[PDB]
């Protein structure tokens, strides 16, 4: 069950859920497998916060094992399109899609907890059909794989040949390892 929370503002008392109460503070939660429905909510929240304050800094916590590539692109393209800086704070795990959004955060505003795990992997896709269809779909997934490598190379700063090499197989990285790699900037330990 979702617990209710009261703001106790000057105007009066209004009850907000635990998730909506944090939304007022420019915070969005990304939990579970990435899909069109949940990803669309993040887009709606990002656009709403933009209108509320186009100068403040947004924070996006990411704890997800991955999901749809198309859904992730809608979030990444939205973050880069809007003017406000979208900070990222990885909590728990961050797989291929989760890592892309983490790396896509504003420079100097990417964070991860001490016991966080970040894994980068190539796109996983499946399709059945005739040889002609297979040849067409194989080119599409190969194209997406190249674009994702360029995105990580741009934010991380590593050359493209290293990204493709490290994404061939599953490669886990800790907070300290990610800072040297370029996926993040600082590891939050304590206040």
């Amino acid at each position: 069950l979702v617990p209710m929370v009261v703001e106790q503002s000057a105007r009066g008392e209004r009850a907000y859920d635990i998730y909506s109460r944090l939304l007022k503070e420019r915070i969005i939660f990304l939990v579970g497998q990435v899909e069109d429905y949940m990803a669309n909510l993040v887009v709606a929240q990002l656009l709403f916060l933009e209108a509320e304050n186009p100068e403040k800094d947004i924070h996006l916590y990411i704890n997800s094992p991955g999901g749809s590539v198309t859904a992730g692109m809608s979030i990444y393209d939205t973050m880069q399109f809007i003017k406000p800086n979208v900070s990222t704070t990885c909590i728990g795990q961050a797989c291929s899609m989760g890592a892309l959004l983490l790396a896509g955060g504003a420079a100097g505003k990417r964070y991860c907890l001490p016991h966080s795990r970040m894994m980068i992997h190539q796109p996983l896709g499946g399709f059945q059909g005739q040889a002609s269809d297979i040849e067409i779909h194989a080119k599409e997934i190969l194209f997406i794989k190249e674009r994702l490598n360029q995105i990580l190379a741009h934010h991380t700063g590593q050359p493209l040949d290293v990204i493709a090499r490290d994404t061939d197989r599953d490669r886990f990285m800790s907070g300290d390892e990610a800072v040297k790699y370029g996926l993040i900037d600082k590891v939050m330990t304590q206040r």
Binding site: A51, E55, F81
Partner: protein
């Protein structure tokens, strides 16, 4: 006497004001053509000479009142600065709407004709502004009530201002003075109008192809009145018919970098010099290094309180020094630097020995 051209009047205004050329020329042109009206009283189908009452507006510390102060010392016609807050509806106990006309008579020796030639400036017009765009249920006598009461005079009327004596008489032959000849310049700082025009100009939507704008910001104050239109005045609370009575609308850019660096010394009366003059009586010199000036200029910007803020900055820095010099004699001069202004350093004290 020789109907000074707009250039011949602005010259004196430029002596003190720094950068208010938009307003200075508006007044210059108005004053110039206004003088002609007094001389152009011939019945040659050139008698109407309608006046477009100006409504000076802009942020604080923009030399709004200053203009009237300097213009009062130049105009050959009796000029009287006014305020819209103290005068209240005659019906309700208080000062009367006509008393301001009497103020002109005081400086005009009650020569109604000469008085008529004079001008009438009214600062602080943002106060009378209706509580809300739409009138409230409680009458705003100290507000739009006075607005309408003065309105008829603006249109043109006659005022039965009393003389200096004759109390014995029941009405003491109340002096009749025309109002259509008395030009009107309405001054005032329209605090909050920036948000009005900001939304009126564009109402920030949502979406990739929207016009999303800052919800609430005080960073657009600069040149925030260059798109103001009568509609926005109404929203602020200026009754529509009252707005029409004043066709001209002036605009006063908040400030500029050059004006803040220049204002410390350039104007005739300069804050720096004011302290230096006082320091002279004490027996010390106030040498303000050029970098010092630029430092204070920047400091004024954060306060966002207008040119007035400059005074506070210098007073804060020159506090220990002014408290020490009397008790600490043998001080020939006190050099100032940019570090001193910033606060990292303490004002350099000089000694002849």
């Amino acid at each position: 006497h020789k109907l000074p051209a707009p250039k011949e009047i602005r010259t004196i205004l430029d002596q003190y004001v720094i950068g208010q050329e938009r307003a200075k020329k508006v007044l210059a042109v108005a004053v110039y053509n206004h003088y002609k009206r007094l001389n152009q009283r011939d019945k040659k189908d050139d008698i109407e000479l309608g006046k477009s009452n100006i409504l000076m507006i802009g942020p604080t510390g923009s030399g709004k009142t200053l203009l009237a102060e300097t213009l009062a010392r130049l105009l050959n016609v009796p000029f009287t600065i006014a305020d819209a807050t103290t005068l209240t509806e005659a019906g309700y106990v208080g000062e009367d709407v006509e008393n301001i006309i009497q103020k002109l008579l005081q400086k005009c020796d009650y020569d109604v004709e000469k008085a008529q030639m004079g001008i009438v400036y009214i600062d602080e017009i943002d106060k009378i502004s209706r509580k809300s765009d739409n009138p409230s249920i409680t009458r705003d006598v100290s507000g739009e009530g006075v607005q309408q009461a003065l309105l008829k005079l603006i249109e043109g009327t006659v005022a039965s201002v009393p003389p200096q004596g004759g109390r014995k008489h029941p009405q003491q032959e109340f002096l009749q003075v025309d109002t259509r000849n008395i030009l009107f310049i309405c001054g005032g700082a329209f605090a909050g109008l920036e948000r009005v025009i900001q939304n009126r100009s564009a109402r920030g939507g949502i979406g990739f192809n929207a016009e999303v704008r800052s919800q609430e910001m005080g960073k657009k104050v600069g040149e925030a009145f260059k798109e103001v239109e009568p509609e926005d005045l109404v929203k602020f609370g200026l009754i529509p018919e009252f707005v029409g009575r004043l066709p001209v609308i002036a605009t006063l850019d908040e400030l500029d970098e050059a004006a803040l660096m220049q204002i410390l010394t350039e104007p005739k009366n300069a804050l720096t010099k004011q302290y230096a003059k006082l320091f002279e009586m004490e027996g010390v010199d106030l040498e303000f290094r050029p970098d010092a000036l630029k430092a204070v200029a920047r400091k004024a910007l954060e306060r966002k309180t207008g040119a007035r803020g400059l005074r506070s900055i210098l007073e804060g820095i020159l506090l220990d020094t002014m408290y020490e010099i009397p008790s600490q004699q043998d001080v020939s001069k006190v050099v100032i630097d940019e570090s001193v202004i910033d606060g990292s350093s303490q004002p350099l004290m000089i000694y002849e020995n």
